[PDB]
Amino acid sequence: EMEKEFEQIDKSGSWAAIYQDIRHEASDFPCRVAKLPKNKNRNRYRDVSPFDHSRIKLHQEDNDYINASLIKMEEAQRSYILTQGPLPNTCGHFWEMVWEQKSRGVVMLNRVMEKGSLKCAQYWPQKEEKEMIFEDTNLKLTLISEDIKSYYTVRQLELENLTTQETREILHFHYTTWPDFGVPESPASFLNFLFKVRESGSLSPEHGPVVVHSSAGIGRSGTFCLADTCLLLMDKRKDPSSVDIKKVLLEMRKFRMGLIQTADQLRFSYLAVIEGAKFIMGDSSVQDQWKELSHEDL
Ligand SMILES: N[C@@H](Cc1ccc(OP(=O)(O)O)cc1)C(=O)O
Ligand SMILES: N[C@@H](Cc1ccc(OP(=O)(O)O)cc1)C(=O)O
Numbered sequence: 001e002m003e004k005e006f007e008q009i010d011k012s013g014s015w016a017a018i019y020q021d022i023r024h025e026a027s028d029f030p031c032r033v034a035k036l037p038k039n040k041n042r043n044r045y046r047d048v049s050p051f052d053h054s055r056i057k058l059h060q061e062d063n064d065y066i067n068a069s070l071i072k073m074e075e076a077q078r079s080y081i082l083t084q085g086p087l088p089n090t091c092g093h094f095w096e097m098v099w100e101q102k103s104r105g106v107v108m109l110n111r112v113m114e115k116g117s118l119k120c121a122q123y124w125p126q127k128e129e130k131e132m133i134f135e136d137t138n139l140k141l142t143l144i145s146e147d148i149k150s151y152y153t154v155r156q157l158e159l160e161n162l163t164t165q166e167t168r169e170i171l172h173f174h175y176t177t178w179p180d181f182g183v184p185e186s187p188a189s190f191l192n193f194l195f196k197v198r199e200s201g202s203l204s205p206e207h208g209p210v211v212v213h214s215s216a217g218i219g220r221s222g223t224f225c226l227a228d229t230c231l232l233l234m235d236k237r238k239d240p241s242s243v244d245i246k247k248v249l250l251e252m253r254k255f256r257m258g259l260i261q262t263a264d265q266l267r268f269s270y271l272a273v274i275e276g277a278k279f280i281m282g283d284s285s286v287q288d289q290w291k292e293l294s295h296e297d298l
């Protein structure tokens with residue numbers, strides 16, 4: 001099982017080598033659409049692009065490109081859309097995607113400003129009375145309510161297709177203390193947050209895939225999805241030992257490049273899954289422990 005493997009890798013001090021082996025074995029598929037000259041201003045990073053086979057296509061006749069990938073986990077029966085933090089000119093495309101893909105939740109794992117630089121546009125309204133209208137995609141977005149915790153905030157937003165007047169409730173789960181190329185403060189804080197997303201019903205198969213993003217949509221995003229899928233896998237079978245975490249990560253990498261950006265994020269993923277397995281296997285009390293340990297109260 002992964003716990004024994006975690007021990008071997010830890011004692012050997014080989015997280016860097018294990019992680020590097022994953023980078024070496026990772027899939028390489030073309031990203032020709034992402035690289036078209038007309039799409040230059042739709043990519044936040046030159047080196048992070050969606051593969052053509054798994055990219056999400058916007059349903060507009062103009063230009064259907066958005067730096068977003070559909071991670072379809074067949075065995076686990078869960079899909080996620082991993083995307084970069086929207087740019088000033090792609091906020092309308094972002095919400096168009098949320099609408100068209102029928103997503104119920106948006107998981108944001110970064111902050112708008114990190115390390116003195118703008119890593120993501122302010123794509124949602126910060127005040128109820130100042131709603132946002134994305135003219136290019138004909139969508140209106142209104143902040144309905146906000147529940148601010150110590151290291152994450154949950155928001156209820158109302159997305160409206162101005163063309164048809166149909167409205168939908170979108171839940172925003174914002175993890176505010178996870179530095180890029182870094183790991184969460186503890187497996188507890190992370191699991192507490194993941195469980196809040198799960199409890200909301202945003203990951204349910206009755207909804208479109210949850211949209212997960214960070215700045216690039218691969219590091220922190222990849223860590224979140226890897227832990228969730230691994231937990232879901234062992235949950236379906238109620239068998240912790242049936243999950244090969246490296247293999248699951250490689251499977252995800254068939255859909256988007258660079259998922260999990262550092263060896264420590266991989267190590268953290270193992271920790272999160274191993275700890276989460278306690279809940280999956282019947283000890284529901286650990287959830288309350290995580291809530292305590294996370295110190296979510298201000
Ligand atoms: N390598 C580039 C792009 C990059 C940025 C962030 C990143 O992680 P995340 O997906 O967690 O935002 C991954 C890659 C950079 O370091 O700026
Ligand atoms: N951090 C990289 C993003 C990235 C990293 C790795 C990657 O694939 P691989 O790990 O196999 O090299 C793909 C994309 C960059 O922005 O330069």
Ligand SMILES: [Mg+2]
Pocket residue numbers: 127128
């Ligand atoms: Mg106010």
